Design an enzyme around this catalytic site. Sequence first.
Site, PDB file in Angstrom:
ATOM      1  N   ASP A 189       0.842  -1.180   0.000  1.00 59.16           N
ATOM      2  CA  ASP A 189       0.000   0.000   0.000  1.00 59.16           C
ATOM      3  C   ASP A 189       0.880   1.233   0.000  1.00 59.16           C
ATOM      4  O   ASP A 189       1.209   1.821   1.031  1.00 59.16           O
ATOM      5  CB  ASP A 189      -0.891  -0.088   1.229  1.00 59.16           C
TER       6      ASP A 189
ATOM      7  N   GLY B  47      -1.524   7.541   4.675  1.00 59.55           N
ATOM      8  CA  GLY B  47      -0.590   8.128   3.753  1.00 59.55           C
ATOM      9  C   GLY B  47       0.475   8.914   4.473  1.00 59.55           C
ATOM     10  O   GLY B  47       1.528   9.163   3.874  1.00 59.55           O
TER      11      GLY B  47
END
Lengths: 51, 223
Positions: free
Chosen positions: B84, B178
Amino acid sequence: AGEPPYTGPCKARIIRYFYNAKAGLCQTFVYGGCRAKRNNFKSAEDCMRTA
Amino acid sequence: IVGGYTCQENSVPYQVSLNSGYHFCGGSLINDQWVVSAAHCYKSRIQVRLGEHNINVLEGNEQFVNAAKIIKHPNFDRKTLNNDIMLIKLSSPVKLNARVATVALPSSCAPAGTQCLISGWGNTLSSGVNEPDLLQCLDAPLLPQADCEASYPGKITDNMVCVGFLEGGKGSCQGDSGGPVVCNGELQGIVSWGYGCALPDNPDVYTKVCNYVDWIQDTIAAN
């Protein structure tokens, strides 16, 4: 669509719609970004129709 | 970030906000034209906001740059969250300065027990919602791989690392994905997933950036 809104395990803040059964409408909730369940829609109109 | 503290104004100059109308994910500036974030933060149109402290007030220190190319890792799995990681190429290079700076990519993988600094504008509460205006910070340790696996049997791959406290009380939450996990001056993790926010024996798991340095460098060169 009677199931509760599922934020999921991911940690993004994505505003999505779910049908709030006991209220009769589509409301916004925070979706985490992955593993969406079916009571999770990108628009109010999508949500209203499918319910 | 649940159970953290307000970061001192621009003590985290590599932190960015990813915005598509509202803030939805963080990311890190790795050089004047590229940002690394999580692949589940993908959107087709993203504006990157750099130099932010208070996300809801124009302070006059920010640079707002649109994403020209967004490249997810080719092997990202939407269901297991393996790999990811996502790279964003900015439309123009940013103006590096006091408040806008780069974070170094890792030299090697950091060992369990290393303290790390996590930051983000995500939810501050484990139950309920309270989104901060100001960037929050948290200091927490990389946990041993075995404890990570015992908290989430079968879901941990070698490209994931757990950070946190197994008795709960502190951790990242929705709005933090993130974002950076910096351990000793290097970006070692990217905020990805966990069950709940700051719950006992459900630590946070991050993308292990040290497994991707060559994919990062080779992608910035080909692009």
